[PDB]
Automatic annotation (TrEMBL), chain E:
The organism's taxonomic lineage, starting at the top: Viruses, Riboviria, Orthornavirae, Kitrinoviricota, Alsuviricetes
Official protein name in the record: Structural polyprotein
Shown chain mapped onto the complete sequence: 266 to 325 of 1248
Species: Chikungunya virus (CHIKV)
Subcellular location: Host Golgi apparatus, Host trans-Golgi network; Host cell membrane; Host cytoplasm; Host endoplasmic reticulum
Function text: Provides the signal sequence for the translocation of the precursor of protein E3/E2 to the host endoplasmic reticulum. Furin-cleaved E3 remains associated with spike glycoprotein E1 and mediates pH protection of the latter during the transport via the secretory pathway. After virion release from the host cell, the assembly protein E3 is gradually released in the extracellular space.
Organism domain of life: Viruses
Assembly, per entry: Homodimer. Homomultimer. Interacts with host karyopherin KPNA4; this interaction allows the nuclear import of the viral capsid protein. Interacts with spike glycoprotein E2. Interacts with host IRAK1; the interaction leads to inhibition of IRAK1-dependent signaling.
């Protein structure tokens, strides 16, 4: 039988199955692009000194 | 887990130097069962060793 | 309705482990001891029709087999299975028998007959349990980890169940040859008496009544009863019909396996003295524990060990880290403290 | 076996003692079963005619009392009348749910 | 809706080609019919219909 | 007089491994497996009145399992102790049952019920006591020394022993109130029935009457069976005073252990050939035989091994002497003379 992908997790990996899932796939980068509303950012006069 | 986990400061003494790692576990599922994990007999291990 | 035991016919089989070194035509033929039970429910095939009354109906205290060309009905209590210990009987439906028996390499099926006829069914039954969790624990646990596993349940209804029954070859009988003394004065008893007489002229006949032969000895007449009254579970250990081809039926079967769960143990994780990149975990396992260390990054070096006594694993923990899956619990984390 | 049963023709007169059976077959209908001879009206008007297995049935007539009588919960309508004359629905319960049997049309 | 064939005619499934009540009287004829419907999908409903508690000693 | 079951009560506790994998509230639940005895006396804690009569008789043939609001008394031979197989029960009184089983890791204490309900409490009972001696003994010796060890002795005196005889918990009672006709004609039937309707108003009362309620839960009238007549030896399976404070009691505890001395055998004298500084001894053990050879003086060299097959160990005999002990006989000293 042997150890499964959870039992044999390289990469610091979290093995998931049915469906296969990289829970804690410890690798790489994630590009997060937040186009937020700019009116959330109060201006240079909007802040205290 | 030490050989001498129950320390009798007197031979029929009233004090017991004992840190057995008796950790209470989660409750019994719908039935009154004491979920409580402890270390084994350290003098029973001293009986074993 | 479901008169499948009425459709059943008790037929004994020449088993090899019958007791005293002699296996014979007993009603206790272990046909196919299925080890498909993922949780540990053994599905054995029995030579009797277990759970069958004398009229083919339910015998709620009775066990059914074929005794002496008739139904061999007995008590349902005495039919036991000794694999290595007194086995936990699950169910008796037809040939199908449910076993929560002990672990072993052999299996005898010892059934107490009506005249105390303890028929043995001896074979190698390598009863070995499958592993749940990391701990080598045998018992049925009080609390612990949920393992969704198999279980060879005793579903007696034949949903995908099909036993190959058939009218077998002719049941031989030494009483069918009658004392005609040099005549063939064969008594029938109402059976399909295929008598091959060893004398002149008509030394044949699938007779239905008693005959009288001239010039043919009683040792010449080989008589047998026509085994064509019911479908019997046509396994290889039974004498199949050489007078039949493939004319055989398939009836519902017992013992349907299903998916169940199990409770496993998670033992007390020992103290971990943390020194420089190395934590000594003084674990005291009470079952044979699977403790695994894995690297926290790409190069895992996936070590695993089975524990019998207490031991202090000096885990040289990486800077990437170490996953320590001991017991049945979640694996411990090792990040090196700066 | 669902029977608060009785004699199939056992009825009283106008003001007569309509003594129907509403009982089990092996003995009585229950009292915590409420073996009664309850009212059965035009359109099948179920109600307490004589109910509660030892007691009366209010909303049925003033005579109706389902009790221990006959061979069952005896639905004794002591003054079951032309307005009380209907199906004495023999009720037998299990102490969880009450089931009307056939009843006796008085 | 089924097609039972008991060597006589293409009858329905449960009201078979010669079904029902096959096992209580002609059990060898039931064995030939289980040769038919053991190889027969529509006689699988005779293997459960005139077979599965549908013999000639069927009490209903 | 000591009617120990008078304040006692057979308490059916939820033993998890009862047989067939299911937990059940049987009184043969293994409360406390006292494995303290050095000589093999295992004291199983019995939740019923094992060895005590159900009617409070002191009867060795009567084991009263406190079944369903009564004491149900069964035969004394209904209990076995299958650890690896059925072991020899030495005694059984009330809450205690001290016996001698074989080697094993699970322990199913089987008990006979009144309908033969084999309450076989299966816990993990890792039973194998390490015996002292120069050989790994199995049985009682022919001639051998009585080494002092423990023994769970058969005096059932409740002095220097105690059970935590706390208050009996209130029994749950779904059986009390009936659904009269489908509606609220509920009954008491002679107890301290903590009744509580599934609606306001009639929603409380620890009385013994019937509930006349409508339009609500007929099952919503949920009650309890109050038993203020006895305490219980407060096993951890038993639900304690969370519907109580700390009103707990204490009673005696039987089956008290004391010291004994068990006789163990010593093996045959091995064949010893003494050549030039060399003492070759051929030990053939009947058990795992401790053979230890050391110096007779300041250089210890205290080597030792358990022996399992025939072994011709050649000790280079020291000038300070070869002190060897091979089995339970006293050791040979070697003076390497000449």
């Amino acid at each position: 039988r042997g150890a499964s992908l959870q039992h044999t997790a390289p990469f610091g990996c979290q093995i998931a199955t049915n469906p296969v899932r990289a829970m804690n796939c410890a690798v790489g980068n994630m590009p997060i692009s937040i186009d937020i509303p700019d009116a959330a950012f109060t201006r240079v006069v909007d802040a205290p000194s | 887990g030490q050989f001498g986990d129950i320390q009798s400061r007197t031979p029929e003494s009233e004090d017991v130097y004992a840190n057995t790692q008796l950790v209470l576990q989660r409750p019994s599922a719908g039935t009154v069962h004491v979920p409580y994990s402890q270390a084994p007999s350290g003098f029973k291990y001293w009986l074993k060793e | 309705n479901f008169n499948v035991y009425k459709a059943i016919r008790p037929y004994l089989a020449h088993c090899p482990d019958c007791g005293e070194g002699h296996s014979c035509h007993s009603p206790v033929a272990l046909e196919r001891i299925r080890n498909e039970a993922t949780d540990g429910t053994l599905k054995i095939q029995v030579s009797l029709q277990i759970g069958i009354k004398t009229d083919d109906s339910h015998d709620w205290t009775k066990l059914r087999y074929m005794d002496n060309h008739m139904p061999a009905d007995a008590e349902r209590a005495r039919l036991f299975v000794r694999t290595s210990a007194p086995c936990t009987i699950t169910g008796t439906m037809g040939h199908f028998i449910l076993a929560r028996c002990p672990k072993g390499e052999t299996l005898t099926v010892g059934f107490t007959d009506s005249g105390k006829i303890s028929h043995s069914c001896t074979h190698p039954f390598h009863h070995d349990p499958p592993v749940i969790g990391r701990e080598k624990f045998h018992s049925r646990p009080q609390h612990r980890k949920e393992l969704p596993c198999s279980t060879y349940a005793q579903s007696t209804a034949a949903t995908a169940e099909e036993i190959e029954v058939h009218m077998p070859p002719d049941t031989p009988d030494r009483t069918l040859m009658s004392q005609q003394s040099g005549n063939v004065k064969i008594t029938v008893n109402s059976q399909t008496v295929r008598y091959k007489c060893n004398c002149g002229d008509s030394n044949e006949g699938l007779t239905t009544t008693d005959k009288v032969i001239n010039n043919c000895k009683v040792d010449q007449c080989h008589a047998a009863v026509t085994n064509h009254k019911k479908w019997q579970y046509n396994s290889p250990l039974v004498p199949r019909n050489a007078e039949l081809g493939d004319r055989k039926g398939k009836v519902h079967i017992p013992f349907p396996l299903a998916n169940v769960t199990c409770r496993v143990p998670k033992a007390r994780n020992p103290t971990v003295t943390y020194g420089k990149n190395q934590v000594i975990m003084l674990l005291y396992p009470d079952h044979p524990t699977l403790l695994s260390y894995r690297n926290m990054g790409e190069e895992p070096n996936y070590q695993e060990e089975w524990v019998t006594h207490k031991k202090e694993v000096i885990r040289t923990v990486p800077t990437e880290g170490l996953e320590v899956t001991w017991g049945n619990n979640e694996p411990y984390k090792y990040w090196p403290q700066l | 076996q669902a029977v608060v049963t009785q004699e199939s023709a056992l009825t009283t007169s106008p003001g007569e003692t309509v003594t129907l059976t509403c009982r089990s077959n092996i003995g009585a209908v229950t009292s915590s079963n409420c073996a009664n001879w309850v009212q059965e009206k035009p359109d099948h008007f179920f109600t307490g005619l004589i109910g509660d297995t030892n007691n009366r049935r209010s909303g049925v007539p003033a005579r109706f009392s389902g009790s221990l009588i006959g061979d069952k919960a005896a639905l004794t309508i002591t003054g079951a009348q032309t307005e009380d004359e209907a199906i004495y629905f023999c009720a037998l319960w299990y102490n969880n749910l009450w089931v009307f049997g056939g009843g006796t049309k008085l | 809706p089924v097609m039972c064939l008991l060597a006589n005619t293409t009858f329905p499934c449960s009201q078979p080609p010669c079904t029902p009540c096959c096992y209580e009287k002609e059990p060898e004829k039931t064995l030939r019919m289980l040769e038919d419907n053991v190889m027969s999908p529509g006689y699988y409903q005779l293997l459960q219909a005139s077979l599965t508690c549908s013999p000639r000693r069927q009490r209903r």
